[PDB]
Design a protein around this ligand. Structure first.
Ligand SMILES: C=CC1=C(C)/C(=C/c2[nH]c(/C=C3N=C(/C=C4/NC(=O)C(C)=C4C=C)C(C)=C\3CCC(=O)O)c(CCC(=O)O)c2C)NC1=O
Ligand SMILES: *[C@@H]1O[C@H](CO)[C@@H](O[C@@H]2O[C@H](CO)[C@@H](O)[C@H](O)[C@H]2NC(C)=O)[C@H](O)[C@H]1NC(C)=O
Ligand SMILES: *[C@@H]1O[C@H](CO)[C@@H](O[C@@H]2O[C@H](CO)[C@@H](O)[C@H](O)[C@H]2NC(C)=O)[C@H](O)[C@H]1NC(C)=O
Ligand SMILES: CCCCC/C=C/C/C=C\CCCCCCCC(=O)O
Ligand SMILES: *[C@@H]1O[C@H](CO)[C@@H](O)[C@H](O)[C@H]1NC(C)=O
Ligand SMILES: *[C@@H]1O[C@H](CO)[C@@H](O)[C@H](O)[C@H]1NC(C)=O
Ligand SMILES: *[C@@H]1O[C@H](CO)[C@@H](O)[C@H](O)[C@H]1NC(C)=O
Ligand SMILES: *[C@@H]1O[C@H](CO)[C@@H](O)[C@H](O)[C@H]1NC(C)=O
Ligand SMILES: *[C@@H]1O[C@H](CO)[C@@H](O)[C@H](O)[C@H]1NC(C)=O
Ligand SMILES: *[C@@H]1O[C@H](CO)[C@@H](O)[C@H](O)[C@H]1NC(C)=O
Ligand SMILES: *[C@@H]1O[C@H](CO)[C@@H](O)[C@H](O)[C@H]1NC(C)=O
Ligand SMILES: *[C@@H]1O[C@H](CO)[C@@H](O)[C@H](O)[C@H]1NC(C)=O
Ligand SMILES: *[C@@H]1O[C@H](CO)[C@@H](O)[C@H](O)[C@H]1NC(C)=O
Ligand SMILES: *[C@@H]1O[C@H](CO)[C@@H](O)[C@H](O)[C@H]1NC(C)=O
Ligand SMILES: *[C@@H]1O[C@H](CO)[C@@H](O)[C@H](O)[C@H]1NC(C)=O
Ligand SMILES: *[C@@H]1O[C@H](CO)[C@@H](O)[C@H](O)[C@H]1NC(C)=O
Ligand SMILES: *[C@@H]1O[C@H](CO)[C@@H](O)[C@H](O)[C@H]1NC(C)=O
Lengths: 658, 295, 98, 98, 30, 87, 49, 49, 49
């Protein structure tokens, strides 16, 4: 009831035609030699996309149904082939218990998509992949003749459909008429390397995760490796689990106190309030309050959740309609110069909404003022609520003088005036991130702590991968995070337990692959340089032994010593010897001999020989040259004009080559 | 390519004997005492006395080659450098020839010089009494054989006293092995710099990749991650270029050591100041960490 | 030449055909910097390799004068044994001494 | 942007919109346009959710009169005599490839 | 009246824990 | 004033939108108080493993501290070195 | 290509296949006796008949 | 030193004088990167010679 | 016409000589070397033609 799949599920990733190339790509593929489930009807889940194969001879498997909920309260799509035609239909079907082949649906309503095709043992295979509101279908056909299972082979799949459906697809179900069999496998995000022949089709492909040999093939970017020893990627441990930690905060933030306040101050006398110990759940504002302006500097609005803030201040005031564009970094005007100033390196969010009913009355509302005369501009986050008469020279005066005015000017708000002369309430929120203990924090759900293996962690918005260990550092009360010499985040404080945790990565140690050449065989040995296997190895082996260099898996340890063929290290060498196999030994220094020393005897030659010996020495190499303009820019004129500004690189390069 | 060149350097310097010779039980060859340059059988080490003295002087940066995960996962309270190097992807590989094999090679060379003379290097091992070999070498430098034979005893005494002087002067003086130790230090220094350059933000918003990915969108994080990637790639390229330049100088020195071993240990040289100051008689090789010492 | 170096495409025609002027001059300069750095790396490798070739050629030149034009008394400089004489032969980019 | 219509981060296309008050707004009140304001998550790019079932914050199936059981769709109220922020706008989004 | 500071007025730059570290900064110092 | 070395810790920062250009002390009705001005300069610090900031050097008082800032260490070997500009 | 340079295109009217190649090819070297000497030069085109 | 490296000027004062922090710390970074690369190339050539 | 030119300035700011880069192989050599006086030999040039 379960089988394996090998070299199944390769399709064209693009519409680019290329030939005689080895292209490398990374996306959702079915892994090589992976588990598939066989059926000879349940509700099979989707989870990322599906590889679906059907061995049949009498055409009994026809079409599918995809949908989140199989009731009629959701939206579902059927891809069915009746006796004469292929019809795709996305609607609100009430799915019967047995979708028998016609009459699968009892009724259909409120519906969006319909496609109807032209009038219409062996194996048919499909790949269904859903992303960005598009359902991609790939199809391949193979004339096989075996019956218990899926035959091992390499077959490519071609694109036929991408359907524009906005559907939650979490479940699917096949449709049967009434022998044959159908098999289901799950796609995963992996890296593959393909090969393109002269005609332009794909003939071979290799995974980069099943084997160390596959990792080496992807690294060197070839399908043929000579005899030797090669350094591959270090030993990786995949994360299995998740920990999410957040402080003990229950109550929500005072949205009604800040936004729905009875009155707001003037812009020259703006008011600042501290926000602390609350959960920023702004989705409760989706019913009453709506904002004409909302812009965030420093962070993304989508990342306003999943994140946890340190020191939040709210500044509130009232401006008129066309002054709201002055509440920004790097602006000039009457508000930005003399009333309210934002720093250049500002992290926060500015949000403003129109209040004409509550602030503008008939016959005027002259209660809001702004300053338009001042000796110099304001510093960031400063206010000046003084009221003294202003004279341009810089001398005190009296307001009935000629060069003596009042520095404040009244806003005039009426009910019947254009939007540029209407009241607007503005709130500026300021905060910093990843700097201090956090008291106002985002809405999430916490998870219990795991202290042994590699997990994804989320500590107050700090996201990463590693292992969590108990530590013994001494944090001051104002310190939340610690960093290393390379500014890695080594230590953290738990917001619930208040213990100190130490974070280190979960990949460690170098790996080498020893091969006798892919032409000779397809067997390899693996050397783990810093483990003691007398573990932290991966999948398997038959012979495991500990050299002075490290742990060797896949080789036989002989006792006799020969000359060195493939140098492993620390006195250990290895070769391919006779059914041939890889053997490892200690290298031989030379032929053993001895000569006796005596103080009254001497050895004298009585014959000679003439010997000629060859010695090869390199003398020269190839002379090369480069056109700097043709290599960098080609034939583009605009590139050449932009390249003229990079003076004295190409001359300095041609001079060296000459 | 650099690592393969290092192994070839060691092999070309030391493996110059076609066959290995057993050290004699008698270290006293006609008044010349060879006890301090040949291995001691009952002593646990298979190096000489002078080789032990040379190995003690170079404070070798202990390269591990067995640093398990639990050893670096523990001992966090001492911020060790090799643990940080291995955590950031930097690895040091062990040499092909261990120290014992090099000591065996030098013991075979000295044993061949004490018994066969100058003939095993340019042919087969032809044994000869040591005094007749010294007479031949005096004849080589322009002095008749009777000068050796008349006053052999005080010549042997001077030889033994000079060996004793060398052994004494390698127990106190520190700067003597200055060209080897510097090499070790240089490598370590470069590699340590490759860790500290991970703290530079390269004109991005932060040096930590997690914070950049955690508080920004896709398209805004692409620019910062690209700046970090470019900076770290060019830092690694600078490291590799410096290593490639240093390896050429090491190779030139190893070539000179190989030709000195070939022309002064296996023979007698008439080139002026090629092997010592004065008229050359013979030379003895001793092993050292990443190097050789000629007497 | 197929790398992006942080730009939107490695094909310069696409960038010049779909983007505005000022935005194209930002995407182009990344490709220019990347290709200059690649070509600089190539030249540095060639300069390092030429030194090794020159040292080998110097040894081959000094071995022609002291072994083909004379008889050397240096041990193992020209073959194993007592050197009688030596002959040169040409080879592709090299010399072969008998 | 959370419960009704979502655009991808790597979006290629054009967004355009124009004001239609004379054809979409009446003085009595045009209540023919609705929007979802309650959902158990955020939409993915170019997805749709046309479903009117009662919503409860805990997550269990519900009966429409209850303590905390709500209808998820609100009605736009489009009167003629209201400010520019409450007037109807028609939006067309064009998605491309090159 | 007149006096001399002699290594006074050094304060914590950040709120980050740092151990076995050397660190260079520009700021308003005495 | 004693000539020793001591580090100061943060206690509080206040959100005040004020030009502070003058200040004055408040005294009850023998003891002394000393006032010095801050200037924008570069310092080089050194932390303790389990403890606090222990060492700190300027880069402008003498050429020796300028050398210490150019090498970025406290222990200097014998010789001649080229220094940057911090004066 | 391997260098991601577009070579092949299908003509959208006739549905034939066309190949684009650069219009610049070959190395050109200039031999001069000196600008202090005469102003004549020789031109060598590398690897063409 | 006269290369702008695709910035608005090869002079630092002009960039600092007609722009603000967020925008002017982008051009200065490009100038800094180009000048460090040129100094690195010079030191590499000297080390080889 | 849109072409490539090289100019020269005196010690009084006055322009004195200039050369087109697309009339002669010698002029192409002058524009590639970026000088007015060229020593004897053989050089490899750009493609301003
Ligand atoms: C189930 C959905 C379904 C899809 C997606 C479909 C697509 C499909 N089937 C095709 C061929 C074909 N379609 C059928 C009939 C069938 N009767 C069945 O129940 C099944 C599953 C098939 C096979 C898809 C046959 C017999 C062929 C010709 C295959 C051959 O003999 O080479 C083709 C033309 C080949 C091409 O364009 O390259 C398409 C597009 N047909 C379908 O029925
Ligand atoms: C697509 O529809 C499915 C079906 O409802 C959604 O799955 C639910 O997701 C919410 C939010 O995480 C959970 O509370 C429910 O328990 C899920 N349903 C079931 C039956 O478990 C899915 O989230 C939808 N996708 C998107 C992107 O909204
Ligand atoms: C803070 O107050 C000081 C003192 O009142 C202000 O300094 C004055 O600046 C104006 C500007 O030309 C001068 O004419 C005055 O002579 C200054 N006063 C003194 C006493 O010198 C300062 O401007 C205020 N802060 C800000 C940011 O404006
Ligand atoms: C028209 C004569 C001056 C022409 C040259 C101008 C030079 C200075 C540049 C811009 C100043 C123009 C007025 C800007 C007013 C800002 C008003 C505001 O934002 O609140
Ligand atoms: C397939 O299932 C078997 C049965 O448990 C399991 O041992 C094997 O690991 C599975 N295959 C993979 C690739 O996980
Ligand atoms: C289908 O929807 C209708 C309302 O449109 C409902 O009355 C009916 O019960 C639904 N079908 C099932 C099987 O519940
Ligand atoms: C198949 O479905 C299509 C679309 O409804 C219809 O036109 C056709 O007649 C059907 N064929 C059969 C045999 O039912
Ligand atoms: C769905 O159908 C119901 C009645 O069947 C109707 O009231 C509602 O407007 C429809 N919704 C859509 C989006 O078509
Ligand atoms: C594919 O390439 C081969 C080359 O061996 C050629 O013979 C064959 O005709 C090509 N296929 C087509 C459809 O042209
Ligand atoms: C949204 O506002 C309406 C208006 O009265 C109210 O009936 C409803 O309960 C509000 N929603 C929530 C979740 O409180
Ligand atoms: C926070 O919640 C945890 C839950 O176990 C509790 O142990 C702790 O005392 C609470 N308070 C603080 C200040 O951590
Ligand atoms: C590996 O473990 C064995 C277990 O007995 C131990 O004897 C050996 O010394 C260990 N290896 C090293 C290098 O210490
Ligand atoms: C030397 O050896 C050769 C064989 O190579 C032999 O023919 C010759 O007789 C030998 N000479 C003497 C003197 O034995
Ligand atoms: C040779 O020297 C060693 C150490 O100097 C000494 O122990 C030994 O007795 C000497 N051999 C003699 C004097 O025969
Ligand atoms: C650690 O701190 C304690 C004070 O809590 C102190 O007594 C001890 O000396 C410190 N240890 C070191 C190594 O400085
Ligand atoms: C226009 O394009 C069509 C392809 O649909 C082609 O058959 C035709 O020859 C072209 N030219 C004219 C003049 O129609
Ligand atoms: C041009 O020269 C090449 C090589 O010198 C030669 O193969 C070719 O045949 C020549 N062309 C003609 C037309 O002779």
């Amino acid at each position: 009831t379960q089988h394996t799949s090998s070299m199944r599920g390769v399709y064209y990733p693009d519409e680019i035609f290329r030939s005689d190339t080895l292209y490398l790509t990374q996306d959702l593929f079915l892994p090589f030699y992976s588990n598939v489930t066989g059926f000879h009807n349940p509700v099979i889940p989707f989870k990322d996309g599906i590889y679906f194969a059907a061995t049949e001879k009498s055409n009994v498997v026809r079409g599918w149904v995809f949908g989140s909920t199989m009731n009629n309260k959701s939206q579902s799509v059927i891809i069915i082939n009746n006796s004469t035609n292929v019809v795709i239909r996305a609607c609100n079907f009430e799915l019967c218990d047995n979708p028998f082949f016609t009459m699968i649906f009892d009724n259909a309503f409120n519906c969006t998509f319909e496609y109807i095709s032209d009038a219409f043992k062996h194996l048919r295979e499909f790949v269904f992949k859903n992303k960005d509101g598009f359902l991609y279908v790939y199809k391949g056909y193979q004339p096989i003749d075996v019956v218990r299972d899926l035959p091992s082979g390499f077959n490519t799949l071609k694109p036929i459909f991408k359907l524009p459906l906005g559907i939650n697809i979490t479940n699917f179900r096949a449709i049967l008429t009434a022998a044959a069999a159908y098999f289901v496998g799950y796609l995963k995000p992996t890296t593959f390397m393909l090969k393109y022949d002269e005609n332009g089709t794909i003939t071979d492909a290799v995974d980069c995760s099943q084997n160390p040999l596959a990792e080496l093939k992807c690294s060197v970017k070839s399908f043929e490796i000579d005899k030797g020893i090669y350094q591959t990627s270090n030993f990786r441990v995949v994360p299995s689990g998740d920990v999410v930690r957040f402080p003990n905060i229950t109550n929500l933030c005072p949205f009604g106190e800040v936004f729905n306040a009875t009155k707001f101050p003037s812009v020259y006398a703006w008011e600042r309030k501290k926000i602390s110990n609350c959960v920023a759940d702004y989705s409760v504002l989706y019913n009453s309050t709506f904002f004409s302006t909302f812009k965030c500097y420093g962070v993304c609005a989508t990342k306003l959740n999943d994140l946890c803030f340190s020191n939040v201040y709210a500044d509130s005031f009232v401006v008129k309609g066309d002054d709201v564009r002055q509440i920004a970094p790097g602006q000039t005007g009457v508000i930005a110069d003399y009333n309210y100033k934002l720093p250049d390196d500002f992290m926060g969010c500015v949000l403003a909404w129109n209040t004409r009913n509550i602030d503008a009355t008939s016959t005027g509302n002259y209660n809001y003022k702004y300053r338009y005369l001042r000796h110099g501009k304001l510093r960031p986050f400063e206010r000046d609520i003084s009221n003294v008469p202003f004279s341009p020279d810089g001398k005190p005066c009296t307001p009935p003088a000629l060069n003596c005015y009042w520095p404040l000017n009244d806003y005039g708000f009426y009910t019947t005036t254009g939007i540029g002369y209407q009241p607007y309430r503005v709130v500026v929120l300021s905060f910093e991130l990843l700097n201090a203990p956090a008291t106002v924090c985002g809405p999430k759900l916490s998870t219990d702590l795991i202290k042994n293996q590699c997990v994804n962690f989320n500590f107050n918005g700090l996201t990463g991968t590693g292992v969590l260990t108990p530590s013994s550092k001494r944090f001051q009360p104002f310190q939340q995070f610690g960093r290393d010499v390379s500014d890695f985040t080594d230590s953290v404080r738990d917001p619930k337990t208040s213990e100190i945790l130490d974070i280190s990565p979960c990949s460690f140690g170098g790996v080498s692959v020893i091969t006798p050449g892919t032409n000779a065989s397809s067997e390899v040995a693996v050397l783990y340089q810093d483990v003691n296997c007398t573990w932290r190895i991966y999948s398997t082996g038959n012979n495991v032994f500990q050299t002075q260099a490290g742990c060797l898996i896949g080789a036989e340890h002989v006792d006799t010593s020969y000359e060195c063929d493939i140098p492993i290290g620390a006195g250990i060498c290895a070769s391919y010897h006779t059914q041939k196999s890889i053997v490892a030994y200690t290298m031989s220094l030379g032929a053993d001999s001895s000569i006796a020393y005596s103080n009254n005897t001497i050895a004298i030659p009585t014959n000679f020989s003439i010997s000629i010996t060859t010695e090869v020495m390199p003398v020269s190499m190839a002379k090369t040259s480069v056109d700097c303009n043709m290599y960098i820019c080609g034939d583009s004129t605009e590139c050449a004009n932009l390249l003229l500004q990079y003076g004295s690189f190409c001359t300095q390069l041609n001079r060296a080559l000459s | 390519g650099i690592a393969a060149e290092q192994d070839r350097n060691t092999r070309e310097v030391f493996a110059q004997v076609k066959q290995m010779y057993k050290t004699p039980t008698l270290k006293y060859f006609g008044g010349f005492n060879f006890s301090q340059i040949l291995p001691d059988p009952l002593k646990p080490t298979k190096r000489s006395f002078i080789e032990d003295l040379l190995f003690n002087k170079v404070t070798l940066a202990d390269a591990g080659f067995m640093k398990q995960y639990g050893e670096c996962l523990g001992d966090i309270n001492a911020r060790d450098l090799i643990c940080a190097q291995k955590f950031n992807g930097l690895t040091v590989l062990p040499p092909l020839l261990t120290d014992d094999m090099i000591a065996a090679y030098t013991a075979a060379l000295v044993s061949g010089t004490a018994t066969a003379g100058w003939t095993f290097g340019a042919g087969a091992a032809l044994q000869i009494p040591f005094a007749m070999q010294m007479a031949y070498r005096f004849n080589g430098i322009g002095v008749t054989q009777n000068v050796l034979y008349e006053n052999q005893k005080q010549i042997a005494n001077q030889f033994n006293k000079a060996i004793s002087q060398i052994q004494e002067s390698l127990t106190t003086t520190s700067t003597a092995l200055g060209k080897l130790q510097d090499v070790v230090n240089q490598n370590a220094q470069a590699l340590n710099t490759l860790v500290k350059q991970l703290s530079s933000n390269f004109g991005a918003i932060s040096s930590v990749l997690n914070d950049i990915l955690s508080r920004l969108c896709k398209v805004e994080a692409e620019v910062q991650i690209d700046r970090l990637i470019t900076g770290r790639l060019q830092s690694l390229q600078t490291y590799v270029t410096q290593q490639l330049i240093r390896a050429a100088e090491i190779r030139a020195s190893a070539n000179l050591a190989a030709t000195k071993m070939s022309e002064c240990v296996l023979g007698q040289s008439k080139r002026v100041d090629f092997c010592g100051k004065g008229y050359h008689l013979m030379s003895f090789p001793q092993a050292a960490p990443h190097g050789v010492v000629f007497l």
